Amino acid sequence: PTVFPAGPLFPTEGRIVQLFEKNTYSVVNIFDVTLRPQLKGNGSGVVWDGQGYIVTNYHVIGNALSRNPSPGDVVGRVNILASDGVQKNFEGKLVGADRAKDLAVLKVDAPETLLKPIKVGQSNSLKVGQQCLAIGNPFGFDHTLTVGVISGLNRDIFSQTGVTIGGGIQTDAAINPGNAGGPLLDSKGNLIGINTAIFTQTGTSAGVGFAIPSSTVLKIVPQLIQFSKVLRAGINIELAPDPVANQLNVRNGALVLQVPGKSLAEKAGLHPTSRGFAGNIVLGDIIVAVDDKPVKNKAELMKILDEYSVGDKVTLKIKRGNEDLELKISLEEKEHHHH
Amino acid sequence: PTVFPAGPLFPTEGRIVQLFEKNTYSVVNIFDVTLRPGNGSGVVWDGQGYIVTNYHVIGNALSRNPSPGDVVGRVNILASDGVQKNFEGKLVGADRAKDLAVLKVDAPETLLKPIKVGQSNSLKVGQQCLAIGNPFGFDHTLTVGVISGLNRDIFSQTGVTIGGGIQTDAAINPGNAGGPLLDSKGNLIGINTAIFTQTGTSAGVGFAIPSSTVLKIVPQLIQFSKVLRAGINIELAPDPVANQLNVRNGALVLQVPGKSLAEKAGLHPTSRGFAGNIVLGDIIVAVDDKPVKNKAELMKILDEYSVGDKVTLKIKRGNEDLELKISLEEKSSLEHHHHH
Amino acid sequence: GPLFPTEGRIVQLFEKNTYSVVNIFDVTLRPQGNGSGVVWDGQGYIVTNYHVIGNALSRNPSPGDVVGRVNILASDGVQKNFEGKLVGADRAKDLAVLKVDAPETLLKPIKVGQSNSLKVGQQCLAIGNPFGFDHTLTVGVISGLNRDIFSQTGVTIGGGIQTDAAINPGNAGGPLLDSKGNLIGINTAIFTQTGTSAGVGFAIPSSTVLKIVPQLIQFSKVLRAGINIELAPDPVANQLNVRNGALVLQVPGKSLAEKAGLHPTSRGFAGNIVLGDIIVAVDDKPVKNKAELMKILDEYSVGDKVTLKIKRGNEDLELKISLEEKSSLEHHHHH
Amino acid sequence: PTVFPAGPLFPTEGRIVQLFEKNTYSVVNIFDVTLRPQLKGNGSGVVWDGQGYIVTNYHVIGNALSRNPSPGDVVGRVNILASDGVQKNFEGKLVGADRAKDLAVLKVDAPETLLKPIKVGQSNSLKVGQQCLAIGNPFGFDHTLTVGVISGLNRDIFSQTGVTIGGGIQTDAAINPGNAGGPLLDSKGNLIGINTAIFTQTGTSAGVGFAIPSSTVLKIVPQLIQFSKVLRAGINIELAPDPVANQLNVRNGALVLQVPGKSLAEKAGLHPTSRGFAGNIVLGDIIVAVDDKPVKNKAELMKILDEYSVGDKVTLKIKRGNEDLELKISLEEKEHHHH
Amino acid sequence: PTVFPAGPLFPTEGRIVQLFEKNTYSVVNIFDVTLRPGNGSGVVWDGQGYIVTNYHVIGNALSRNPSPGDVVGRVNILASDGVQKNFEGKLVGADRAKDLAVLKVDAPETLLKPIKVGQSNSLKVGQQCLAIGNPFGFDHTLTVGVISGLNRDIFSQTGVTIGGGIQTDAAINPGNAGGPLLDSKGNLIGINTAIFTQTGTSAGVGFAIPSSTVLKIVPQLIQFSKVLRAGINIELAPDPVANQLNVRNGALVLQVPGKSLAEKAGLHPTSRGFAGNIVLGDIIVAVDDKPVKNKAELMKILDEYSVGDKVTLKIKRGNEDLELKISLEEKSSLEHHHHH
Amino acid sequence: GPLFPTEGRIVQLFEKNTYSVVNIFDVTLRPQGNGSGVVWDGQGYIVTNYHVIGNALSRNPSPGDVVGRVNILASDGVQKNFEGKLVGADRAKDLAVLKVDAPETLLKPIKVGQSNSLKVGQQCLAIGNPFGFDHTLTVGVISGLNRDIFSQTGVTIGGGIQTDAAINPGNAGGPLLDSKGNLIGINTAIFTQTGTSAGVGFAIPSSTVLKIVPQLIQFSKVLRAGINIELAPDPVANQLNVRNGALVLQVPGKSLAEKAGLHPTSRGFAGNIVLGDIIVAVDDKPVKNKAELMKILDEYSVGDKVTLKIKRGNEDLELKISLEEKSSLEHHHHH
């Protein structure tokens, strides 16, 4: 029977083939060394720079980070593809980690020649409809690719960390164990996010997955490198996710859902939402501005606070009913999902 | 490290981006007022504020027997200033059989950007399609794939299977249910429709009600608040079942409710004997003169007759070709799949 | 309607190829298995998955038995029904071959491509004819190469193509095509360990189909000689830092392999792991991983004497062993 | 190591041992012949009388009955334990079946010597707390036993038939595939019910199972023997289960939940229950008496109707709100659960 | 065939039958008024109409922050004429930590048959027990087994684990939740309590709150509407976890919330190091003078102190025996298991 | 409080026997396997399920290795902790033996009964010591005899006792006692095919424990000779109307059994079933079912020559065959 040889590719698939090939080198495989395999976690990472710094999800080395390691502790095995086409194995020493953003940084001792840093794009200028490519190196002997479009922006990631991440990219490229921790790339091969594994509420797939946007990666990684951690200042309250807030007709601001016992929030004058014995619902305060740096949703509020330091005193502009009130509060050090 | 700014888009992703942005305005958000923390998307049908969605997105409200005029939804519509504005959605009419509902919003015609509607009958498997949603009233969603199949049963979360549906490999989910499926020219070719499968298992394809159906049902709901259908109360085999039984042309009669018009007319159903030797229920190949290829077509053909009408059914009863006559009556029975 | 370039090309490729994609109903199943197949040649040979006629195959049919009803789309747009008589089947590769008695005019054999030159990122079309009344299409890219397929036959197939086109009952047994419309694999239904979908599916590569199908036509089955040992799948091996060769995991009591002097992999109580031999050469022919070793031994026959070059820890040893028929197929236990 | 021999048993366990042994002979095994086994339905039945009549659940030969068999058709393989201690295999020809009560009768051609009829007790005089023994012969090579107490009376059985059976016995003896179709016996060895397999709403076991009471078996079996079937007359409406009715504060009568299109019920003047757009609930009529044979719950109503014949005209005494109204209706021939 | 009439009952089944019938009257039915088609059984506590049940059977009503006096339940009580009569159940008080709630019914003392309460502290594994329910207000249910275990954690469907519970192999289910567990003399030894397990899997045993707890909590709810507890906000290891870590005496401190009284007092928690070498958090062996066997006992001991009180904790820190002093404050934190 | 007769007897039987029921924690498991065991004798031998120390056993411990921590209830009401050193293990019967170094005064060996004289309907007590701080009890009746146990080791054990006393992690590895407080089996955790509970549990009969435990003490393991064939479980066989003997289902290629001339069971395509040979005699010793055949062959050794009397259809044939070590344990695949 006649076998037709590989012929020229069409323009679009041709470009994807080239983008994938070129970026394979920048996508590493990571094995969590604390896992005794079945001899009868883990995933991908991205080469951050020529120094040997590696970026991955907190979760891909979750089990290891659950053992309270200090910087320098060998926490991963890293496989890096060389020009020779073969993957070389390196010690991944822990640099820093941040569970809230499901990001972890490792450092490798490797020849700069061997290391090919990912190109970084701007996630803030992404448009729904843009092509994206999710690359993985899940086992350190090959690479994987899924392709789809930016499906939504500024969506919550229900990370398998257990903590939900605000401001996530949604894509209809398949995101799975084969690419978790690896890069989401745009049509130019620029990193626009980190493929992030999630848990859904139900068992059924909605056919879409998620990436931590590069804007967040750029903000977090250097902090992890310098300080091994991100110290955050904020308010220990529970705010409504955009979907809940909007369903309750809160179109603007951060709706306060809960304000726990004797909290700083309590003492400053902030009210939660509830149901009365009638079945009536009683809306909580809505934070519209910090000082008066405008707030329009939960996620942006978090990003406002994440930059102040502990003890900073600020002025919350709030909405309760139709009124508009200013409130003082001091910030202290800064939760999960049911998935 | 160094940050590279938004580059120029390639042609295909470029078109998709512009089609999406252009169509955000026509894709509204609907919250069922009877729910607390259904719900999903809809489509601006015309400049008068008529809104089209799935029966299922306002299913809870519809179950409580509301009357036309009742506020059953809160409708969010994207204005040119980029913020979504809120409107009461009054019920116009609903049709469970086709999983469609129509609401009416009181808004400035200057606000409303009616969706552009195309012809689903000309669709080709392989064509690009975009499924758009506005599931929470604060942004929009997109998925993209191809037309994967045509004339397929939709196991709607209504509990009632819809025939003649479009299959796509664009992800169809709660984030775009009730929203439009568009072709590459941005014409509406269907309404994204949530389904239940028999298993807990994704086949990786989704479904939409074809625009040809929407075009037929919506004006009736607007004019009458409901769809009156003439038909025959019998159970017909789904196409995959009929073909498995080697019935390659016509609609196969499976079950015939006791003392029905069908029974009195002498229509025979389908029975697996204790040995195992199948007599095939009658097979309907023609209504009067016009040929019937399958179940979907029989339904489509009948839907154009009136409740008074007496028709002649040309049927295959085993080997022989025979004729039975029957009066059509209001087609009330619903086709319940029992997927969950 | 008028169409844009890429979608225009898919629409035409799909239409052109519908004729070569048949529908198969397993005749041993009563209504309320089953799927698609491909026309292999003008004599009426039809290729499909073992699994799409699995029920019939479980009943030990002989070649010539009517195991399926086959529907084939004719030039006039209607599908015609034919008796599908069994030609041969191979559970190990989840492939089966039927023969229909039909006119050449009806039969449009699929064109076959070269799966060994595939590149991740290439467009693929997965086509089905699930019910004999229409055809289905899903479109994605090649997502991965040389991946294990956990076939619904219950047996793991090495060397599979991974794609992010949806592979489902609507196209199982059907062709996976490249952008030239050349067959690059056969869409193959799988069971996952969990059930949670990863958004990717699998196809047996056409190189395997090319190897197996003529043997089924001639002999009705494929006989294999090998070694009764358990080899490490690639992920597990590369977790243990074995980047080359077939890592030997388990080694049976009193086996040919034992007699030959080949070591299994052992976790000692003192928490440690010690590595089984790694097979890197069969008759000095380089062995790259498990799938490669399997491919290589499949070319021998029962009784043949071969020389294995193994890596025992940091050593280099050459063993003798005689190949025998194997005690099992490789059963994953996914459901 | 020293091994102590079987010694005398204590009184209670001694009696159970004896009851079990003695009744094994009366408990048969039934294989549904339409099932091709895995060569690389079904359960137990009870010997009804010396004629060879066998009583089991509809469900244990469910697959066979799904093929529309006529009386006389060989529908089961029956294994009967003989004094010799060995089970002998017989043809089970279908006598009759009733899906609504999940009962089926088979007839065997066997030596009267071989057949040991079960002793039948009165289920109507059962008391919660009484000891019960559930016996099975699931495979025709041994027998099984579970022991518990009557846990509740007049409870719905959500049979694996798909149809719920009113008036069932609840027991905390384990009811399972090992005894489905077999007898539930009281402390004297008298048959008080037929162990009946069910589907639960949720997946969690409540630790209790069910038996069709002997009162029902006694009423149904002879009809199946004479007529191969039970013809029933009734009203094609949907009535509320006791638990729902009581929760809505209907303590007496049969609460009408649904009255479908153009039904006899429609035309006679019967109303269903519903929720209004408010979320308000609107109670349907409550049938308190047929003619004036008092009704106090769904189950007793069914048992009133099951004795009239088709076309009989009766007078429903109903409650709507506070009033009390009489209603005429003619009965026609006579539904499932979501489990 | 021939029908044999009700024979005489044997002694054990005979006793069970009479105990059950006798106790039906004390076992009421409770419907949460905030639910539509929670709910279960309760126990008549005294002749004044005080009703005892699980917090969980009226959980939905309690979540809406009702005040004492609010009608949160419909209570059905079996009278001597054999019919259940209906009463408004007004909330008296609830305690989530012990999964107990008290309602108040306005009824003729002649109607009310208070349950007889026994001593759970004298219970022996192997004793016969009966679990009675009145789940729908039209009859009663019974299950029977033995006391299977003592002082076991109850993973209450409240979401909060209760220490010191009774384990039985009588089936405990929605049909008897909130109802009494009785001994062979018909004394109340516990309240049947619905649980969540970690798996979807029955171990075939159920749980009840011991009467010793009920005896302590109920009068407080009647007098005060709530229970005030003095304690220490720290996380203590469940007994099965402590023993697995070879801590065979005392309460093992797992976690110590940042800048708590416990922290400032110098109590050390438990940490698994990156190598793997466990330093055991402090182990509390005595409060002041009185010895502490395990976690349940520490809680029990603390519950008798007052919010003012300063106590001396004798602790095991690795090998050495040490003392840390701490003021008790209101024990607010709840112990959430996360089973579903 | 004062107690009624039957409950009084249980309470006392339970208390008296707590001392003989120990707690075992598998030392290879880090906290947040494990269960109960029985004191076998005054030298400190402890019997439990293979599965309760399964993790440790997976790591290939040698006899003498500390595989468990054992807690034993002393006369003063507190449990004392001891190193549990491995003596022997047998996965096939889900049994393991440990040895503790303790004073005779501490050790109260369980009294052993006769499982072969058990009657359905008898009272049984299932006792546990799951955590080393108390004991648990469940009470039921003997519900069935000679039933397959689908052990959580993954291997099916024939000849098991079925009871409607709850068997759970709280008593796995612990004793099942009769009304005299005699050991009649070891409570054994199982996996069911579905997961849906049938309200009954299982115990390895003391006759099996009696047979296995001394061999583990002497030799650390049990070696078995048998036939590499697949035998029909009793339900399946009695569905096919085989009421006596071991029905042979599967028969490997080039097996000793094949060479011997023994037929498998076959479903022909023409819808029919044809019966594999039924083994009814090993050296003219009557074979009643699968479990009996297994018991019988376990008494031989590798190499022994035996005569099988089979029933081939309506025939009567006598074959020769040599017994070999077996290629597998019998794995159900329940989870």
Numbering used by the authors:
A (entry chain B), D (entry chain B): 104 to 143, 153 to 446, 450 to 454
B (entry chain A), E (entry chain A): 104 to 140, 153 to 455
C (entry chain C), F (entry chain C): 110 to 141, 153 to 455
From the reporting publication:
Plant Deg5 and Deg8 are two members of the HtrA proteases, a family of oligomeric serine endopeptidases that are involved in a variety of protein quality-control processes. These two HtrA proteases are located in the thylakoid lumen and participate in high-light stress responses by collaborating with other chloroplast proteins. Deg5 and Deg8 degrade photodamaged D1 protein of the photosystem II reaction centre, allowing its in situ replacement. The functional unit of the HtrA proteases is a trimer, with three protease domains forming a central core.
